Design a binder for these strands. Structure first.
Lengths: 37, 176, 144, 58
RNA sequence: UAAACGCUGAAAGCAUCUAAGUGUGAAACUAUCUCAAAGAUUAAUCUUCCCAUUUCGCAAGAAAGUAAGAGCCGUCAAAGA
RNA sequence: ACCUCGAUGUCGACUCAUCUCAUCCUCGAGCUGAAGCAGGUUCGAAGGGUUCGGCUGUUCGCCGAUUAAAGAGAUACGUGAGUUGGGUUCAAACCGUCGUGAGACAGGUUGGUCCCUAUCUAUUGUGCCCGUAGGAAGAUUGAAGAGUGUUGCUUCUAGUA
RNA sequence: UUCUCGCAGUCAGACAGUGGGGGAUAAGCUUCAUUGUCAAGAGGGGAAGAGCCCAGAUCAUUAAAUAAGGUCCCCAAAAUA
């Protein structure tokens, strides 16, 4: 999703997943999705 | 947990057969062919009315499989004894569904009607023009088929219109 | 001064063998294959002549590899044209050309040599099992 | 068979103005220079559109 | 197949497109459209024709060098400096 | 302050373009302060293409019109042993200034000479000898690659959602 | 490595390390002092490399111990846990 250099817990529902060696964050909001940790 | 959890067996019709690297299960719902990797890190000691699994060594792959295989066997048992069922709700005034044989056809926001084929081993029941009931013996296939159905139409946040996975709550948006 | 070290003088002869590659990895099989082709393992090695032996490979389509290099590793080859680079993966070679893959893999460890040019062609690579070379009565062996 | 054709016709190229006295040569392959020196191109590359025998092609 | 969207599914009893398994999906890529071709020395394959004119040499035709074909020369063109 | 100044010729204009992506459009996906439409947003993404005219010697740059767009770099500020020198940087002359004076202006102003019979490699076509294993003639597999992979408008579905 | 005598030669050094300055503890840059090298002296390691490491070559050896360094193959050179 979002291009960054790190990932942060945006809210209390921001789980951290590692799909295909790619670390992303999943949360309630579709704007709460980031990438590139 | 899961590796420490053991599940009983009800072999009224269900019986187990050890293949070279697979498992053959027979029960009320067809025959189940459990595909497992060769040289299994886990060992599934099956007794009367009980099954217990354990790994011969400690490996991260083996540690993962300690729960993975147990969950997979439990899901296979519950599927063969009861099946996996899911309801899809197609909400929309012009969004209508019906099924003829294996060919399910939809009238949607697209002017082009969309046709899809029912996969083998899964049964589709069109109880209502806005309701679909998928009933299989494997959760993987029914989930994948539900995704194949929903990829054509998905609910919208401004106004619920699309294929809900049995009418979940969605984020409400607005605009005039 | 000198001891006049003497070696073979055109007394060479190459012996045909049969090998199957199904479980060996590419590099550690190819090194010994090259050593057998050049006759390195023999004691009467002569570079002024040839001292290797013939070799025929059977069912090269079943060669396996460690890790995900079948899908992770890629091999490049450039032809002198725009876009002449061809990039291949391990699984593609198992699908299109494994015999050529192993052939060039063995050729890559060969020295830059006029005889190695005439040595790489001495191996007969087949992804099957039947060929006219069986009439030569090869000495079937393994671990090459 | 068109025999010894021209690159202007073999490749169907375009020639600019002939006014203002722009020298005698007007039908040539254009600039064959891509790079010079032992750092950028140093040569003519393979696969270059050039004239020759035209026709007699199945 | 990339990104991306996934199902089951653990570590993490929830959940998870990934870890095993199971998919979809890009004007890019391997093909299918066209060119071309074994000096592809990696020298390949198939078919067809010719004949072994008694008889030698450091290994066999010194000597009759084809019954097959090609070449030299001319007419030329759908060719073609 | 360097291999090069017993010599690596340039600014630009025309021709040849190529490659790459930090993609402009065409391809795809996701989020929205994305009702629709028109979007913004981040990425994968290099196959193709991305205008014309006026002025400036001017590349550039400004303006007008047009498409979906009029993307960005590199290749000696690519490209004369492919063309031109318009400017530029020979003397020649004037204007304004400076030096008193020869003169100078990183000012303008006018014109003001671009050499080549191709040795080799690469590179595009076509032949000669040999190979392809008795000689000759056809037909091939395909080893290897190469060309090619642009795209707009109108109508219907439908003024429908 | 003292003095005298005769003949000189060189000042356009560079590199690597240390301590620096300037530059920006940018520059294979400049300025310095010091420690070594090439210049003026080759060789092995370093993928090929003047200044790095090991090292200082009368000549012939188809003799041995080695240094740096290296031991899957190209390419001599090992294995066990």
């Amino acid at each position: 999703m979002k291009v960054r250099a790190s990932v942060k817990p945006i809210c209390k529902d921001c789980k951290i997943i590692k799909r295909h060696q790619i670390v992303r964050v999943i949360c309630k909001t579709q704007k709460h999705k980031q990438r590139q940790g | 947990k899961i590796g420490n959890r053991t599940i009983t067996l009800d072999p009224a019709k269900v019986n187990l057969n050890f293949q070279k690297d697979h498992i053959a299960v027979k029960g009320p719902l067809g025959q189940i062919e459990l595909k497992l990797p060769p040289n299994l890190p886990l060992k599934f000691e099956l007794k009367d009315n009980n099954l217990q699994i354990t790994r011969n060594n400690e490996l991260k792959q083996s540690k993962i499989f300690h729960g993975t295989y147990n969950a997979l066997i439990t899901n296979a048992i519950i599927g063969v004894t009861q099946g996996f069922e899911k309801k899809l709700r197609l909400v929309g005034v012009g969004y209508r569904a019906n099924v003829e044989g294996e060919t399910l056809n939809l009238q949607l926001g697209y002017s082009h009607p969309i046709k899809e084929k029912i996969p083998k081993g899964l049964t589709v029941k069109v109880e209502k023009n806005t309701e679909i009931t998928i009933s299989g013996i494997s959760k993987e296939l029914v989930g994948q088929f539900a995704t194949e159905v929903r990829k054509w139409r998905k609910p919208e946040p401004y106004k619920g219109k699309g294929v809900l996975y049995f009418d979940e709550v969605i984020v409400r948006k607005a605009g005039k | 001064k000198t001891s006049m070290l003497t070696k073979e003088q055109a007394n060479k002869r190459r012996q045909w063998y049969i090998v199957d590659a199904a479980g060996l990895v590419l590099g550690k099989l190819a090194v010994k294959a090259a050593d057998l082709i050049r006759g390195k393992n023999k004691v009467d090695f002569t570079p002024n002549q040839d001292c290797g032996d013939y070799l025929i490979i059977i069912n090269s389509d079943q060669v396996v590899l460690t890790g995900n290099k079948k899908e992770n590793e890629f091999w490049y080859h450039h032809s002198q044209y725009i876009g002449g680079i061809k990039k291949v993966s391990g699984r593609d070679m198992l699908k299109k050309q494994s015999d050529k893959l192993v052939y060039n893999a063995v050729k890559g460890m060969l020295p830059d040599n006029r005889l190695s040019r005439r040595w790489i062609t001495k191996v007969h690579v087949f992804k099957g099992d039947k060929h006219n070379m069986e009439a030569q009565k090869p000495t079937t062996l393994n671990w090459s | 068979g068109r025999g010894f054709t021209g690159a202007i016709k073999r490749w169907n190229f375009k020639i600019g103005p002939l006014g203002h006295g722009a020298g005698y040569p007007h039908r040539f392959q254009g600039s064959v220079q891509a790079g010079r020196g032992g750092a950028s191109a140093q040569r003519v590359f393979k696969g270059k559109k050039m004239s020759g025998h035209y026709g007699h092609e199945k």
